[PDB]
Structures are given as C-alpha cells and as structure tokens.
Design a protein around this ligand. Structure first.
Ligand code: XT7
Ligand code: ZN
Length: 316
C-alpha cells in the first residue's frame, strides 16, 4: 500500500526539539520506542494526520538524548520519563484554582498532600537545581501546575491516587534545591556528659522532627542522651530562609503572625487528609478548592514553617 509520512518533533526536555519523518504504516513504538504525546502513551498507535508538527517525548536511546535528559532532570533512572508522562496524563486533568492569591489543586486522586506541598513552596524561598523543576515551578506559581505536580510524583516515586507524606515530599524537593548556604548550630547539654556542639548543612539545617514550635526548639527540648539520662538540645545558630518543624500530629493552637504556614493532618496513618493553614491578615484554611477564614486555629498539626534569615541564641 501507499507509504504516507508526516514530520513531527521528538524530545526528552521539550527545549531541544528533533525533527523526525514518521511512516503512518508503523506504530510510534516501532520507530522511536516508547513515545508520549502530552503524557498519553502512543507507543502502539499509528500516526494520525493531526499529529503533523506536534512534539512527542521519547526515551533517550542515544548519547545526545541521554545527555539532554540528564542535564534537564538531573537523574539517569530509565523509568523516570515514563512515570513523569503517566503522572502528567492525570495531572493535566486536575483543576488548579487560585485560592487566597496562591495556586492550589481541587481534590482528586488523594492529591491533598501535593496541594499542601505546592501551597507551602509558594510561600518559602527555594531554588531548584534541576531545570525541569525550576521551569515547572515557575509555571506552577503562575497557575499552570500540571507539569510541576507530575515531576513531584515522578521524583518522589508516587502513583497518582496514592496518599503521600508532606514531610517526605518536602524532604525530596529540598534534596533537589540549592541549600548550600543553610547552616544550623545545636548544643546538647547533659549534667553528666557536659556540652557538645554540632553544625548541620543543607536539608538537615532546615528540617526537625519532634516539635512543631520554633520557640521551644530555641528554649530547648528534652532528648535521650547516649548515657540514658535526659539531655537538653537547643538551637544556638540558624542561617536559612525558613525552618520546617515537624512532629507526629497533635492538637496545636496556631496564632496569627507567629508562623508562615502549617500542615493539618486529620485521620489515621497513611489514610488521612491534609489541609494547609496560612497566616495573612487572618488565619486561612486552604483545603484544595475550599477556603475558610478564622481569627484563631486549634487542630491536629504535623508541620509548621517559619521564615528566617539569621538567628543567634542569647543562652550562655
Ligand atoms: C499520609 C502518609 C503517607 C505515607 C507515609 N509513609 C511513611 C513515612 N515515610 C514512609 C506516612 C503518612 C502519614 O500518615 N503522615 C502523617 C503526617 C503521620 C505521621 C506520623 C504519625 C501519624 C499518626 C499516628 C496516629 C494517628 C491518629 N490520630 C492522632 C493524631 C492526633 C491525636 O488526637 C490522634 S496519625 C501520622
Ligand atoms: Zn549524658
């Protein structure tokens, strides 16, 4: 029969486009290997006329594509692009309403943890190393978050519909961000073992598990020492744009102007629901597309974010 061809573009980054002549006899899979159009898998689909001039993602099967992919995503995981595309096929159908001047996500597929992560990222100063996240984060801030959400899912190895932990999600994202200048100095004091000082850099400089209260962390927290006597750990020095204080969910009171934003978590381990509390002129509770306002808050909180620049203790 007649051999028909169209010109299309292939890519791994949607920056470097590569002109290809495709036979309309054969599947994309027979000519490129696994191929995606706007996240949708077309590997086993024959080219349509409407495809002419369109861009298709392909797996890097040569050194040029492998390098462009690594430079863009900062990963060599062979399944990364397929997972990104599979997730994108879903997140492009989500609604991203502007709620309180920020981009949120209307609830679907257990995406409350992503909505809360996305709302937190918009409030804190953060530069991503992968251009993929830089580029998608810039679009997410402008209200176009489908790509950013699909990259978060891909980078965090989460299925669409699986409930995730906001603290684990932020931890992954922080590990792909420039925090080289973030520094934390801790002092642990025991009656027996004396005073020992530790300096933490990067992700460990901005995250703490065991208290929601920045003020309590500064005053001092009780931790088990090596000897088995209780010891006091306190913050001596903090240099970072923000700090993230996490703990297992507990009834907490949030007061206007004493924090930036917080993760509320109702329900049981791995099957609950996240809401985002933010401090503006009053306390805002952002629940996907749903918004409520209150002068004060009491609820089960698991993450609190406070802004920072430089803090030095007055203790000793
Ligand atoms: C949602 C989710 C997904 C995946 C994972 N995976 C693992 C962590 N990495 C691998 C976790 C969670 C999770 O649920 N996190 C919350 C913050 C959380 C964290 C820690 C503990 C708990 C809880 C314990 C008990 C609970 C029931 N309710 C309590 C809380 C308030 C009080 O009045 C009753 S929730 C949750
Ligand atoms: Zn001790």
């Amino acid at each position: 029969s007649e051999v028909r061809t169209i010109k299309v573009f292939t890519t791994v980054d949607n920056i470097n486009l590569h002109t290809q002549v495709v036979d309309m006899s054969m599947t994309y899979g027979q000519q490129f290997g696994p191929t995606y159009l706007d996240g949708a898998d077309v590997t086993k689909i024959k080219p349509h006329n409407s495809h002419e001039g369109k861009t298709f993602y392909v797996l890097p099967n040569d050194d040029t594509l492998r390098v462009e992919a690594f430079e863009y995503y900062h990963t060599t995981d062979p399944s990364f692009l397929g997972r990104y595309m599979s997730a994108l096929n879903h997140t492009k159908k989500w609604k991203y309403p502007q709620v309180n001047g920020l981009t949120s996500i209307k609830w679907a597929d257990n995406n409350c943890y992503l909505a809360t992560a996305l709302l937190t990222l918009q409030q804190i100063e953060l530069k991503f190393n992968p251009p993929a996240l830089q580029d998608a984060y810039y679009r997410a801030r402008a209200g176009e978050a489908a790509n950013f959400c699909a990259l978060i899912l891909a980078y965090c190895n989460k299925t669409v519909g699986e409930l995730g932990d906001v603290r684990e999600t932020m931890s992954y994202l922080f590990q792909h961000a420039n925090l080289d200048s973030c520094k934390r100095v801790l002092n642990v004091v025991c009656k027996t073992c004396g005073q020992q000082q530790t300096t933490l850099k990067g992700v460990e400089a901005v995250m703490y598990m065991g208290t929601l209260s920045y003020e309590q962390f500064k005053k001092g927290v009780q931790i088990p020492c090596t000897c088995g006597k209780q010891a006091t750990k306190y913050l001596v020095q903090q240099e970072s744009p923000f700090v993230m204080m996490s703990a297992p969910p507990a009834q907490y009171e949030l007061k206007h102007g004493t924090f930036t934003c917080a993760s509320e978590y109702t329900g049981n381990y791995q099957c609950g629901h996240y809401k985002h509390i933010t401090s503006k002129e009053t306390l805002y509770c952002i629940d996907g597309a749903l918004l409520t306002k209150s002068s004060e808050y009491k609820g089960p909180i698991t993450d609190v974010f406070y802004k920072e620049n430089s803090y030095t203790t007055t203790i000793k």
